[PDB]
Design a protein around this ligand. Sequence first.
Ligand SMILES: NC(=O)c1ccc[n+]([C@@H]2O[C@H](COP(=O)([O-])OP(=O)(O)OC[C@H]3O[C@@H](n4cnc5c(N)ncnc54)[C@H](O)[C@@H]3O)[C@@H](O)[C@H]2O)c1
Ligand SMILES: NC(=O)c1ccc[n+]([C@@H]2O[C@H](COP(=O)([O-])OP(=O)(O)OC[C@H]3O[C@@H](n4cnc5c(N)ncnc54)[C@H](O)[C@@H]3O)[C@@H](O)[C@H]2O)c1
Ligand SMILES: NC(=O)c1ccc[n+]([C@@H]2O[C@H](COP(=O)([O-])OP(=O)(O)OC[C@H]3O[C@@H](n4cnc5c(N)ncnc54)[C@H](O)[C@@H]3O)[C@@H](O)[C@H]2O)c1
Ligand SMILES: NC(=O)c1ccc[n+]([C@@H]2O[C@H](COP(=O)([O-])OP(=O)(O)OC[C@H]3O[C@@H](n4cnc5c(N)ncnc54)[C@H](O)[C@@H]3O)[C@@H](O)[C@H]2O)c1
Ligand SMILES: Cc1cc2ncn(Cc3ccc(Cl)c(Cl)c3)c2cc1C
Ligand SMILES: Cc1cc2ncn(Cc3ccc(Cl)c(Cl)c3)c2cc1C
Ligand SMILES: Cc1cc2ncn(Cc3ccc(Cl)c(Cl)c3)c2cc1C
Ligand SMILES: Cc1cc2ncn(Cc3ccc(Cl)c(Cl)c3)c2cc1C
Lengths: 257, 259, 256, 259
Amino acid sequence: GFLAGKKILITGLLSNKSIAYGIAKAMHREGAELAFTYVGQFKDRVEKLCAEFNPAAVLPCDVISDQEIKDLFVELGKVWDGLDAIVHSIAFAPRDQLEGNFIDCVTREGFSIAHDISAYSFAALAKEGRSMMKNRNASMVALTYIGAEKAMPSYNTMGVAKASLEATVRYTALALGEDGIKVNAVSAGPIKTLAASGISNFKKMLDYNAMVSPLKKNVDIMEVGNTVAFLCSDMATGITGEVVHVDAGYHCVSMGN
Amino acid sequence: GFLAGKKILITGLLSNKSIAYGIAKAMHREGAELAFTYVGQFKDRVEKLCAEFNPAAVLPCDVISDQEIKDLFVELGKVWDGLDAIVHSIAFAPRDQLEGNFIDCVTREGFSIAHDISAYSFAALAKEGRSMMKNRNASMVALTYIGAEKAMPSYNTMGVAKASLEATVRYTALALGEDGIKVNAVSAGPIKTLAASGISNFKKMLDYNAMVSPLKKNVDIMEVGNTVAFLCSDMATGITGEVVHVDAGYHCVSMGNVL
Amino acid sequence: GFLAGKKILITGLLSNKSIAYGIAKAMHREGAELAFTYVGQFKDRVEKLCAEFNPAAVLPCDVISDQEIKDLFVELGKVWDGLDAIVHSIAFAPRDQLEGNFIDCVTREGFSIAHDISAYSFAALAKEGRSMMKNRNASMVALTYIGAEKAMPSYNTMGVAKASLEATVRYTALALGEDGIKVNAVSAGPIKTLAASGISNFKKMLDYNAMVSPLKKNVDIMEVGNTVAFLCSDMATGITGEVVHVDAGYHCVSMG
Amino acid sequence: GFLAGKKILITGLLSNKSIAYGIAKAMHREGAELAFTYVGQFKDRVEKLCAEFNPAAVLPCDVISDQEIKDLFVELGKVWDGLDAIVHSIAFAPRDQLEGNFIDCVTREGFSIAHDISAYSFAALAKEGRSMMKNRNASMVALTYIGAEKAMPSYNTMGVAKASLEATVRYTALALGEDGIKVNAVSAGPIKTLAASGISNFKKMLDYNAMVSPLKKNVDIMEVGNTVAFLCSDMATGITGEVVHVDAGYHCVSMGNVL
Ligand SMILES: NC(=O)c1ccc[n+]([C@@H]2O[C@H](COP(=O)([O-])OP(=O)(O)OC[C@H]3O[C@@H](n4cnc5c(N)ncnc54)[C@H](O)[C@@H]3O)[C@@H](O)[C@H]2O)c1
Ligand SMILES: NC(=O)c1ccc[n+]([C@@H]2O[C@H](COP(=O)([O-])OP(=O)(O)OC[C@H]3O[C@@H](n4cnc5c(N)ncnc54)[C@H](O)[C@@H]3O)[C@@H](O)[C@H]2O)c1
Ligand SMILES: NC(=O)c1ccc[n+]([C@@H]2O[C@H](COP(=O)([O-])OP(=O)(O)OC[C@H]3O[C@@H](n4cnc5c(N)ncnc54)[C@H](O)[C@@H]3O)[C@@H](O)[C@H]2O)c1
Ligand SMILES: NC(=O)c1ccc[n+]([C@@H]2O[C@H](COP(=O)([O-])OP(=O)(O)OC[C@H]3O[C@@H](n4cnc5c(N)ncnc54)[C@H](O)[C@@H]3O)[C@@H](O)[C@H]2O)c1
Ligand SMILES: Cc1cc2ncn(Cc3ccc(Cl)c(Cl)c3)c2cc1C
Ligand SMILES: Cc1cc2ncn(Cc3ccc(Cl)c(Cl)c3)c2cc1C
Ligand SMILES: Cc1cc2ncn(Cc3ccc(Cl)c(Cl)c3)c2cc1C
Ligand SMILES: Cc1cc2ncn(Cc3ccc(Cl)c(Cl)c3)c2cc1C
């Protein structure tokens, strides 16, 4: 397997619809040793779900908390000597930030929270996982969406936060590359997951993507997963600071009839 | 003048080096009626400074505060019936966020403050100014920097914030366009202003820019000012969501002939 | 006027719908002295059309020909001492390159021709105008389209050539800036012009743009021309190698 | 192997330094069946070189000629039923297009030849290979360089041609995606190959890349190769019209040489 032996932490596994789940499947298939995090309440949900991947640890981490992030690495450090990759696959903004008119809906706090959890958290993982990742061709991969590059209806404050996320990825790539750590992002097409169920007309966004995309289909979690897997391998050691669109070609078209 | 009659609010005037000063010079020249904001302490500084532009109003506005922003438009609405443009020319991040290695230096609270003041504040001005700006070919312009697009040494957290500012500009363009309001940013090349005095090797950044840029020079506040003024005119009514680099061509090269 | 005194050559004026016409209107309004070029056949058409701008010269220039380009500058140099700006507003690709599936339709010669006229020509005006333009804060502006950045239906080979154009604008900015010449491009939203009449469903592209754009309207030749004018002014001396979208915000949205 | 069974055509193999060599190494290691093209004179060179990959075919194809391109697929179709991938790794401009001031050096013919060979040829392979590639998750990958996006010294006419190649890639992706064919590009950092030996100060460009990149190193042919390999696998079926930078992060920084 092209991740044989590599020790990789996956955040954001929540259901078997989660992009994290596709990432997990793809890495397990490639011989990685996996560890997972969960937010307070979902301890049991998550342990059950990822038991099939034979996890070396399953640990709490609510990225709102500097402490928990700190502890994540202390505990993980008891199990592993180094860390080969961190997969950041978490996002959040309050419900009210995410439909209707951007300017009517945006609030100071809701803007703040979305950035805190969806963007700052990536640098915070990087900050705390740094020393475990020094000098072993390590990797980080964040999950992002095209609403970072373009104004879309509904995505709103998450679009602005994903923008922050992508800038963070690049500043992080620059800051960690002296330690040999590569840092990249995968910009997924829309996928029906738990996060998606907040959005009332999601099936239509999906249909529009499949219609307008060059490949005339929707992406699935394995396509994304496999891509994240690859970006955590020795094969990608020439790639950093990069956004790879895994979106059936959506990003490259304009005006699909 | 091509801004004659237009009622424009300018934020971020702080010294005669400020980009906002260049913006003010250019708009006054072009016949705009001007109003300025200041942050608490600097009331006297700013009134003295912008007196030469015969301002219709010089009002407090610390964009940390939702209230003050709200009152800004209340007070301004007493003086003016509509508003034609808002020029956003404010940034801030804590000193610690701005040199050395990004990951060593970045903190949760510093990330937060940088975004709050540098990025969210744009949408907040839009949110509160919106009604005064309805259906008169109104305009918004934010100042940005190429550290939004690329990782640069030092810029760090401000880079991330600037990326957020630029997204905000686009989402605001989409949200306000039905009211005929155009929303854009100017991306200035580096210029020696008060904000620049925080950065310890700035003269060298300036010198590098001038060497590497196709135009072999550094931009000044009039080049920026004039561009901002343009983007607030009836001549730019086809332009929105856009970032216009005013940087002597810096953005379009890589690796000059001197390595 | 903010172009008062400036001596500017405008290419591509063909009808009063032409983007060049909007550019001409705007620069005349701003006090520029104008000169125009035309392709062989349209001499009378064009002379009539631009007479209202009181042109210093109206001269043939088919950018397929290196010699005609050369002679354009010889003749112009007999009228003016220096040249303040060149406005490039010309494109062309054979009809067959421009609808249906890109791969079906693209041909070696059609690819070639589209790039020759649509892109190479920009550097060729630069090459030959350069010495008239040295050290007077001169300018060049090309017209481009978002079909350069994204794959669109129909635009095909012209999109590829637009992308080549845009690069030629950047390499030109880099090559000419030591002489103080600024080089930029204005990326226009779609406008119903003679070039547009080649495209069978154009009214629908227009309607889509107006629907999907943040400003909910179509741009016109005055919005484009005003921007071209500005990019030829002393006000814009900090700007080069830039693409300015004049498209009612279309470039910045996705899925609307 | 993640390309086991896949039938892939590789253009541009010229020496064991070629980027095509690294791509070939990678894909053979992943179980691909390989075929190679060469330009007239280099038949023996290339047969010797790629013998270690056990090629199903080694065929002439000068992309100046529509006939040779056509015949490449006729011959290849005698050996294989379908084709899984085409790797386009070929560029050329005449010597005189490639150093000095862009505008002094660009010529009508040189511009033409650069685009014909470096850009049009990709769509030409697509055109003729399309029928062998229908409905099997097939792939195309072109090699490109950041000189397409930015103006750089020396690259000149090739930069404009690369810009054209990247648009061709996007329009090809949109035109072939109804047949399930994905089409992408890899934007390599500079690598010392035969094409590089035309450029007189190449070692310095390399050294500058390494200094300014986040990863503080030069990419090699395997890094590029492996990425190309991946873009031709089933794992990459959600990726098209993309440019992947395999350049040790060069593309995302600015002013990395200012201390
Ligand atoms: N769903 C789509 O269409 C789509 C498209 C592009 C990108 N994405 C992104 O992919 C990522 C994974 O999301 P998904 O689609 O698999 O949805 P999901 O709802 O399964 O995952 C969202 C994750 O964020 C986690 N989370 C929320 N707050 C957290 C916190 N404070 N600390 C730690 N974890 C927290 C949740 O537990 C969950 O695992 C997100 O970054 C999302 O932006 C989704
Ligand atoms: N100076 C440069 O090189 C450069 C380059 C690119 C972009 N810009 C942008 O131009 C803008 C103006 O910057 P400058 O360069 O003139 O520096 P400046 O110091 O004169 O402007 C900074 C301004 O920010 C204001 N400010 C800070 N926190 C504030 C708050 N909480 N509420 C209200 N106002 C606040 C100050 O009053 C001041 O007027 C900034 O957006 C800056 O990022 C500057
Ligand atoms: N029409 C749109 O919707 C639109 C949108 C974006 C960009 N543009 C660009 O704006 C420019 C102006 O054209 P327009 O749309 O106003 O249409 P137009 O038909 O008025 O302009 C076409 C011009 O190109 C000239 N031309 C063609 N072959 C030529 C040659 N060999 N030598 C010299 N001149 C030649 C013709 O004389 C004509 O004036 C073009 O480059 C076009 O690509 C148009
Ligand atoms: N070398 C770099 O630093 C670098 C960086 C980015 C991209 N690239 C690209 O990668 C590809 C490979 O370059 P390389 O460095 O391996 O060089 P190389 O010289 O080893 O290979 C270049 C190839 O183009 C082929 N070629 C030239 N004219 C041809 C024609 N008319 N018909 C068919 N084939 C022809 C040559 O035979 C040769 O195989 C090129 O597209 C190049 O621009 C190279
Ligand atoms: C917080 C959050 C993050 C997400 N990351 C991806 N998605 C899925 C999505 C795709 C397309 C659109 Cl237009 C929208 Cl609105 C949502 C998320 C949804 C939520 C609610
Ligand atoms: C808060 C703040 C915002 C700014 N926006 C632009 N500048 C000037 C600058 C330009 C380039 C670089 Cl690399 C740096 Cl570090 C600073 C700012 C400086 C400060 C202190
Ligand atoms: C040769 C030529 C060049 C052009 N440059 C722009 N246009 C018009 C146009 C605008 C929008 C769209 Cl979507 C399309 Cl397909 C065409 C051109 C038309 C022709 C015929
Ligand atoms: C035809 C051709 C294509 C190429 N694509 C890349 N290179 C090598 C190279 C890499 C970086 C730089 Cl800045 C330069 Cl100038 C050259 C090529 C060289 C040739 C001769």
